[PDB]
Amino acid sequence: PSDGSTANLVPEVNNEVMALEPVVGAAIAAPVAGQQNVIDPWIRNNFVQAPGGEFTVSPRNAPGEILWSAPLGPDLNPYLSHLARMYNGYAGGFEVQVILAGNAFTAGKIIFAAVPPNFPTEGLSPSQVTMFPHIIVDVRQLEPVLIPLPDVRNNFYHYNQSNDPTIKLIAMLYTPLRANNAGDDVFTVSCRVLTRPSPDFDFIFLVPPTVESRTKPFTVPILTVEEMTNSRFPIPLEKLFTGPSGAFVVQPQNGRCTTDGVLLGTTQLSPVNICTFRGDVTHIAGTHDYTMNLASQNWNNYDPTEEIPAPLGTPDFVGKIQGVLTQTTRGDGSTRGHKATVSTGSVHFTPKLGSVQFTTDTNNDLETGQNTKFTPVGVVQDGNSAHQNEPQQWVLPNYSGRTGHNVHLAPAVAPTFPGEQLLFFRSTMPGCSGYPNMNLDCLLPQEWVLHFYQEAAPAQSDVALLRFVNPDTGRVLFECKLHKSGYVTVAHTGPHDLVIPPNGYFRFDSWVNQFYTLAPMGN
Amino acid sequence: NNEVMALEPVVGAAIAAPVAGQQNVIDPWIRNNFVQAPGGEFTVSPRNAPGEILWSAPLGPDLNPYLSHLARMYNGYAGGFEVQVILAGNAFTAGKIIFAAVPPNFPTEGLSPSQVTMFPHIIVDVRQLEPVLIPLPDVRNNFYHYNQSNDPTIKLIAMLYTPLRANNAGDDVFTVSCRVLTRPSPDFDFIFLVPPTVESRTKPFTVPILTVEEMTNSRFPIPLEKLFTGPSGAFVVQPQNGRCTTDGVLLGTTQLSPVNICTFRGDVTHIAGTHDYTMNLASQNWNNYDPTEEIPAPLGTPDFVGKIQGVLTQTTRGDGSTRGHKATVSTGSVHFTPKLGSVQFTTDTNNDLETGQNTKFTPVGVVQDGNSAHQNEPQQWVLPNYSGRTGHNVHLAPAVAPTFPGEQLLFFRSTMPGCSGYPNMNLDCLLPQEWVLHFYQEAAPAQSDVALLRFVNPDTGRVLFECKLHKSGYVTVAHTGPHDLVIPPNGYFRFDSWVNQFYTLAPM
Amino acid sequence: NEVMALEPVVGAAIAAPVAGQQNVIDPWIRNNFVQAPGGEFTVSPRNAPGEILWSAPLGPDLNPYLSHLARMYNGYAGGFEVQVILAGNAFTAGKIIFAAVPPNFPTEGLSPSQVTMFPHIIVDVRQLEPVLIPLPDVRNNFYHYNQSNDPTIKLIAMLYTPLRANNAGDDVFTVSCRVLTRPSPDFDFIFLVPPTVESRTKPFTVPILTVEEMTNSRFPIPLEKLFTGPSGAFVVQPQNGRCTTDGVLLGTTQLSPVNICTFRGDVTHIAGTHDYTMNLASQNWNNYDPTEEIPAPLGTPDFVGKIQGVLTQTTRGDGSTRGHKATVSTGSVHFTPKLGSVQFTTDTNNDLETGQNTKFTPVGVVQDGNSAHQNEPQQWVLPNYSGRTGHNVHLAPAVAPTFPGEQLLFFRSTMPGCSGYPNMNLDCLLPQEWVLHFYQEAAPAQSDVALLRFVNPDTGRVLFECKLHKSGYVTVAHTGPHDLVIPPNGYFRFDSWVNQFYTLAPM
Ligand SMILES: [Cl-]
Ligand SMILES: [Cl-]
């Protein structure tokens, strides 16, 4: 029967069984629930891959790392996830199926454990995980592992919009992955998690769909790289770039947004106001300089007491940005427009305090009482110093000048996993004079910021696995990790501009954690 | 008036079986033997009047040290207790005590005797010899309780219903001592086995074994010297360092390092024509300082008005050059604005402090201008203006005062070094820095508003005094008048039980 | 074949006529295997026959549930069932022997032939099904007391045949092993007792404090970074911040984090110079006794260098106060703190009266700028506490790694500099808060080495593990000098007592 297939090289089924008692589902809730609802029986009889149903055991992983985890709830099953947007509550357990059909030349063990509600998961060692109901499975296991997940609880049922905890199922690497195939290959174990609701699972109260926050599902825009725009300067994207970031510090304040839609740093939604200034202008006698007293981005008064590092859309690099000052008089409609340049490294660039300084091409022709808008165009470089050294995109300006220090900054960003580098969305800024460093990398396209902001989908885990697909051929070009903090990572070493089909798009495939091992992508 | 409490039967953990993960077992000896709660003692005296609540406790594992230790390895519980109360009377006394079951989420604060009778209750005579057995059922609205959720439970209340009438015996005054014993009912059980001592709300509260001499003041980097109690009506006791709650929440400007207590770190700038320098501050960890923080000032900012003399230290990264200069900070100066990010030092040089370099003020002592009144300049109980004149002090830790008649604050006192002049070198803090460290790391939940501490001589075993450690960061004792305490050099504080703020402690 | 040649051994049933009471353990604990805290070991092709890969004595510390329960019981009796898991595959060869070693027999030095002479099992590296070993409570009394630390049977795991396997790429194939335990049916606890009174049951812990939140134990300054390096050239023998795991202070170590380099006493002028002699009095202001079995008064500096600070004095009757910049040279022949005298260099030869108590507050270290830069403060050279008139006495032992690939782990802070170009590096073996913690919570050491894991709480990831030795020092798996790159909120977590052969994963 096995002759020539698997060939007894591999464990067949697991004899271990989790030491959990049976637990009632939604039947107990019937006298106090509003309604008794029904789930399509096909959904109850057929395993389907869970959202966040992929994980990997690779040689980069170390014992103790939680490779997969989830709380009991409708998010364990994509059909139930869509259904849950239509209900107020739930109760009952699941059947989960884990596929671990690793290559016969691999070794290693995984522990699956059920941790009860209100026990902290944060910091558990393998020694400790053994003290919960648990199962230890070999990474070569051929038949899927069946884990029943009961709805241990102290109430009749759960509300979708509450924060009462449920049982968590945990998969942790118990033994490191070892392999003895003779070749110079790496036999990572690709694993899949499938689920179906137990017969005792049921939804509780029918309610208007898509309204409740905690049930909105996460999505990623279908737009192409070329069709999107940089989030750090009002210009389109051009290529995808990965490189090492050990030398410099990646800490932009524009294009900073979390997966569930919280804006960070100086990030705002309009792709046009990303390096604009609006306010009243004042001449400095004897020079071509003007001092601009800042209004808000919508022409309201500017409040320096906001918990923001600077007004929204303030440039997040040191350099000299050339554009045009434009002004209109409210009485006659006279209009004036003059070449102008702002230096963000200048000591008089203090947007947190409310003032910015431009150097213009006039000593007059700019009224004091009129509203003035700086429209940016490009960057410039002082030609007498070293080539390509003036616009330092990864050097933050001092938003309060020499006074004080930068506050309320969005965190810095760095790869966390062995072999991984940041993935940058690269645009080329227009040069206006000299030999400026025109490379501009942002962590998220502005259209993604817009999307995440409007669709406030809660993150099911800390990383969303994305695969980049060529729709003409159907092929995957690379896979990457989109972190909740709003940045992308890929598995590559060295600088590289990605060679991308013009139609390529990002496709969300599974929720994963920071220990997911990405397929090699480079070249 | 009866011996039976008007309570229905109440299911324990049996109801939870369909929804609990597992079934557990408690050692049968624990179920068959009454055990005294650590604070399961109270006294009936002729001073007591109707309405006074002599003792109270909520149902839970903390009434029984065996169950309390067991709970550190379990996730939940459900079910009630049997309470045994022992009355040390004799036939020649008279008076009544009421015991009452108050249901979850009802306020105990303020009941009249008439009203307490309206709960399920028992009326017990002071002459009762046989122990009184009270069932304490786990009235609730869920299947069971989780340790980490702190659900409210039924309370037992003991109140004086009729005053005690008895002859005295000489000048010794007769009192009825009462003790409360407990054991789990058969319907009590634990629910889910979990790795022991992880779940935060099951850690027991303790107080460091250290001796006063071995501890450190929390307001200046110097050892402690003596314990001092005094009346505090005149001034306002409101320090911002060494302020920490029993369950480990830091307050005010309090931080953990005992050496960074009166230090400053930052970049320094010369003031033209003077020997003064202005320091733009960092945090104690050399990070940017954020004035928007919900703190009165950077952590470790001095919390008194005075002139602190120390040494400014600086190191150049390029060559490793180092410079050190005598310096002095006035915390009452208008240029002492650490909340805004700036402090002013008066140094012994006009040339030798470089810009852009990291600079550290190491404090040493306090100084006094000798031409003014002796012992007048360092006012320990006057807060600096952390933003000098641009506003008022913000996010302050609460002020501290005794509320119980006959009680005064207990201070941990040291002597600040004097560098010049005739300064007032007394420094009192509310908590030793080692206690702050202990409370912070061991985040033990407070079971009530007061932790009863006893001070013990370990050689003889004798208790010298008891004091009340309030959940907030301060200690009180029973004494009147200022007094330096007479302490054995090896004496230490020992935690005995949580009590309620009505506890009246024995004088010295 | 898979059966250990042991007779049955009665557990607590035999103790019933002499035990005070009959107790019950939660049956879930009896029916579920739980990993022993140090129940991991690895089989690598570098291993040779005879190497003891793992060992443990029978007792409650093998099981965290039973370990917690023992804190409320007076004694125990009975055996365990051990489950050992082997992560092999069909393409491996090699044998492991497990052996039962009786209570008072030494394991130290056994050859493979001899280990075969105990009751034993020979397990092939390819075995998939877990190995079940009964571990009986062989003894000569009715039961064991927690407070009497009776010796028990030991399980031994030894490499019997070398591992034969291919590697994949540059990753070398290894068989990881895990040891699981659960109480036999004849195991039981004996006498209920107050739950945390008995000393020998207190478990060992390590403060949750952050490196930044802790303090150096050799000078009154905060810590800054973690540093590991090779130490073969020099002698690592500090006398401050030296404390054993079960809370015995060593050398000149004391508890106050501020008195770590202070001096107190009455002062005397040396005529014609800016030097003063301090007649030292104990840190608690008492009379000083040189007979104390200590190298010097507690808190005396443990390095050779010039420490600059401030002398402070107070006149008792008038209340006057004086303060003067001052400097102590620990290598000067007049630095004799063991005898009771130390010499300061001040900035005045006037204004320091006699009979008054005087306190030196340390601030930093100083360097003679005309000499070689970074040459004056030698942290790893001890001063001569008795000057020329004798040698140092009652020192804490010197410290070195014993395992190939291991180096000391130092808690590093940077001393303030006052003048010159001094070596501002200061390394201590234990943070002062760790000294405080061990001293109060006097948990007995279950072996010579406490395995610690260093955790980044943001990601949950373990960054490295290290060995905290009972003698009070830490070692890590690294080669070469290296400042550790640590998240600012990382903390040390205690994992398990392990045996002296435990091999830790490299950085
Ligand atoms: Cl709708
Ligand atoms: Cl403890």
Ligand SMILES: [Cl-]
């Ligand atoms: Cl609390």
